[PDB]
Design an enzyme around this catalytic site. Sequence first.
Site, PDB file in Angstrom:
ATOM      1  N   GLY A   1       8.285  13.383  -9.664  1.00  0.00           N
ATOM      2  CA  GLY A   1       7.196  12.532  -9.225  1.00  0.00           C
ATOM      3  C   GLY A   1       7.115  11.252 -10.038  1.00  0.00           C
ATOM      4  O   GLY A   1       6.882  10.172  -9.501  1.00  0.00           O
TER       5      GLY A   1
ATOM      6  N   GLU B   1       0.854  -1.179   0.000  1.00  0.00           N
ATOM      7  CA  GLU B   1       0.000   0.000   0.000  1.00  0.00           C
ATOM      8  C   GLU B   1       0.891   1.230   0.000  1.00  0.00           C
ATOM      9  O   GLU B   1       1.892   1.287   0.723  1.00  0.00           O
ATOM     10  CB  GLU B   1      -0.906   0.058   1.236  1.00  0.00           C
ATOM     11  CG  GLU B   1      -1.728   1.356   1.278  1.00  0.00           C
ATOM     12  CD  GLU B   1      -2.709   1.443   2.437  1.00  0.00           C
ATOM     13  OE1 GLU B   1      -3.395   2.483   2.544  1.00  0.00           O
ATOM     14  OE2 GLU B   1      -2.801   0.486   3.233  1.00  0.00           O
TER      15      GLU B   1
ATOM     16  N   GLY C   1      -5.651  11.780 -10.818  1.00  0.00           N
ATOM     17  CA  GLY C   1      -5.040  11.964 -12.121  1.00  0.00           C
ATOM     18  C   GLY C   1      -3.570  11.606 -12.186  1.00  0.00           C
ATOM     19  O   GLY C   1      -3.093  11.090 -13.205  1.00  0.00           O
TER      20      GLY C   1
HETATM   21  C1  LIG Z   1      -1.546   8.348  -1.276  1.00  0.00           C
HETATM   22  C2  LIG Z   1      -1.143   9.488  -1.699  1.00  0.00           C
HETATM   23  O1  LIG Z   1      -0.524  10.233  -0.979  1.00  0.00           O
HETATM   24  S1  LIG Z   1      -2.398  10.476  -2.549  1.00  0.00           S
HETATM   25  C3  LIG Z   1      -1.724  12.185  -2.700  1.00  0.00           C
HETATM   26  C4  LIG Z   1      -0.547  12.309  -3.666  1.00  0.00           C
HETATM   27  N1  LIG Z   1       0.203  13.567  -3.244  1.00  0.00           N
HETATM   28  C5  LIG Z   1      -0.161  14.810  -3.503  1.00  0.00           C
HETATM   29  O2  LIG Z   1      -1.226  15.125  -4.167  1.00  0.00           O
HETATM   30  C6  LIG Z   1       0.794  15.828  -2.932  1.00  0.00           C
HETATM   31  C7  LIG Z   1       0.794  17.113  -3.755  1.00  0.00           C
HETATM   32  N2  LIG Z   1       1.463  16.867  -5.035  1.00  0.00           N
HETATM   33  C8  LIG Z   1       2.726  16.529  -5.188  1.00  0.00           C
HETATM   34  O3  LIG Z   1       3.599  16.337  -4.163  1.00  0.00           O
HETATM   35  C9  LIG Z   1       3.162  16.352  -6.642  1.00  0.00           C
HETATM   36  O4  LIG Z   1       2.366  17.270  -7.439  1.00  0.00           O
HETATM   37  C10 LIG Z   1       2.999  14.855  -7.181  1.00  0.00           C
HETATM   38  C11 LIG Z   1       3.818  13.791  -6.404  1.00  0.00           C
HETATM   39  C12 LIG Z   1       1.480  14.472  -7.190  1.00  0.00           C
HETATM   40  C13 LIG Z   1       3.632  14.799  -8.608  1.00  0.00           C
HETATM   41  O5  LIG Z   1       4.998  15.185  -8.518  1.00  0.00           O
HETATM   42  P1  LIG Z   1       5.746  16.103  -9.656  1.00  0.00           P
HETATM   43  O6  LIG Z   1       7.188  16.304  -9.236  1.00  0.00           O
HETATM   44  O7  LIG Z   1       5.086  17.442  -9.840  1.00  0.00           O
HETATM   45  O8  LIG Z   1       5.537  15.079 -10.919  1.00  0.00           O
HETATM   46  P2  LIG Z   1       5.923  15.059 -12.397  1.00  0.00           P
HETATM   47  O9  LIG Z   1       6.264  16.465 -12.790  1.00  0.00           O
HETATM   48  O10 LIG Z   1       6.958  13.993 -12.661  1.00  0.00           O
HETATM   49  O11 LIG Z   1       4.517  14.675 -13.114  1.00  0.00           O
HETATM   50  C14 LIG Z   1       4.523  14.544 -14.568  1.00  0.00           C
HETATM   51  C15 LIG Z   1       3.117  14.158 -15.034  1.00  0.00           C
HETATM   52  O12 LIG Z   1       2.219  13.952 -13.830  1.00  0.00           O
HETATM   53  C16 LIG Z   1       1.050  14.819 -13.978  1.00  0.00           C
HETATM   54  N3  LIG Z   1       0.586  15.319 -12.638  1.00  0.00           N
HETATM   55  C17 LIG Z   1       1.371  15.682 -11.543  1.00  0.00           C
HETATM   56  N4  LIG Z   1       0.642  16.172 -10.504  1.00  0.00           N
HETATM   57  C18 LIG Z   1      -0.642  16.117 -10.936  1.00  0.00           C
HETATM   58  C19 LIG Z   1      -1.938  16.498 -10.301  1.00  0.00           C
HETATM   59  N5  LIG Z   1      -2.015  16.992  -9.110  1.00  0.00           N
HETATM   60  N6  LIG Z   1      -3.072  16.291 -11.077  1.00  0.00           N
HETATM   61  C20 LIG Z   1      -2.984  15.761 -12.368  1.00  0.00           C
HETATM   62  N7  LIG Z   1      -1.852  15.395 -13.007  1.00  0.00           N
HETATM   63  C21 LIG Z   1      -0.739  15.590 -12.267  1.00  0.00           C
HETATM   64  C22 LIG Z   1       1.586  15.959 -14.838  1.00  0.00           C
HETATM   65  O13 LIG Z   1       0.466  16.638 -15.373  1.00  0.00           O
HETATM   66  C23 LIG Z   1       2.421  15.236 -15.892  1.00  0.00           C
HETATM   67  O14 LIG Z   1       1.684  14.801 -16.982  1.00  0.00           O
HETATM   68  P3  LIG Z   1       2.617  14.739 -18.368  1.00  0.00           P
HETATM   69  O15 LIG Z   1       3.905  13.824 -18.109  1.00  0.00           O
HETATM   70  O16 LIG Z   1       1.729  14.289 -19.604  1.00  0.00           O
HETATM   71  O17 LIG Z   1       3.043  16.248 -18.634  1.00  0.00           O
END
Ligand SMILES: CC(=O)SCCNC(=O)CCNC(=O)[C@H](O)C(C)(C)COP(=O)(O)OP(=O)(O)OC[C@H]1O[C@@H](n2cnc3c(N)ncnc32)[C@H](O)[C@@H]1OP(=O)(O)O
Length: 162
Positions: free
Chosen positions: A90, A74, A119
């Site tokens: 990410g 998980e 997403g």
């Molecule tokens: C269980 C879990 O914890 S659920 C919660 C997950 N965590 C969060 O939401 C925390 C807030 N967000 C973050 O820390 C970051 O935005 C992450 C981990 C979600 C993504 O990390 P990043 O360093 O920005 O990722 P990265 O730039 O490699 O992402 C690339 C792709 O992911 C997509 N992506 C990243 N974040 C998001 C989002 N919030 N919504 C939709 N798409 C997303 C991008 O659009 C992109 O698409 P593409 O390759 O066609 O251009």
Amino acid sequence: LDFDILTNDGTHRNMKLLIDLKNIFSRQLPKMPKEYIVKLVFDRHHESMVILKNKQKVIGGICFRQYKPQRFAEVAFLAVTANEQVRGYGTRLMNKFKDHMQKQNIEYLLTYADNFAIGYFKKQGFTKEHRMPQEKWKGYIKDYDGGTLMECYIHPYVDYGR
Ligand SMILES: CC(=O)SCCNC(=O)CCNC(=O)[C@H](O)C(C)(C)COP(=O)(O)OP(=O)(O)OC[C@H]1O[C@@H](n2cnc3c(N)ncnc32)[C@H](O)[C@@H]1OP(=O)(O)O
């Protein structure tokens, strides 16, 4: 830029890194009780893979819990610090994590995602439909009626983090 598995071994070094990761999680997952994040990050069942910059600065990571005999894990928490987002980290992190799971003989990943996060996971191959029967994880992974349980199959011979 390294992707290392952080062990809670009680040393000042690893401890600082886990706290750093924990603080990133609480910052990026504001609705998540901070004491809960602390609980899981430091309990003996969870592990964290961090994105290490310059061999000392944590800029993101994934906290997960393996259910080894069952062959599934998980994903508890996942995040990249705000000032380092949209730079491909990410995705690189998830690929590194999948490669590790493949090596750990883990067949499926499960995670409860926030509407806004769905997403990101779909992008990483996770789906709302499950190929794994409910009966399989029931009793190991909590069944919440108010979240979206997503699943990702880890193929034994697909090249991840390539
Ligand atoms: C269980 C879990 O914890 S659920 C919660 C997950 N965590 C969060 O939401 C925390 C807030 N967000 C973050 O820390 C970051 O935005 C992450 C981990 C979600 C993504 O990390 P990043 O360093 O920005 O990722 P990265 O730039 O490699 O992402 C690339 C792709 O992911 C997509 N992506 C990243 N974040 C998001 C989002 N919030 N919504 C939709 N798409 C997303 C991008 O659009 C992109 O698409 P593409 O390759 O066609 O251009």
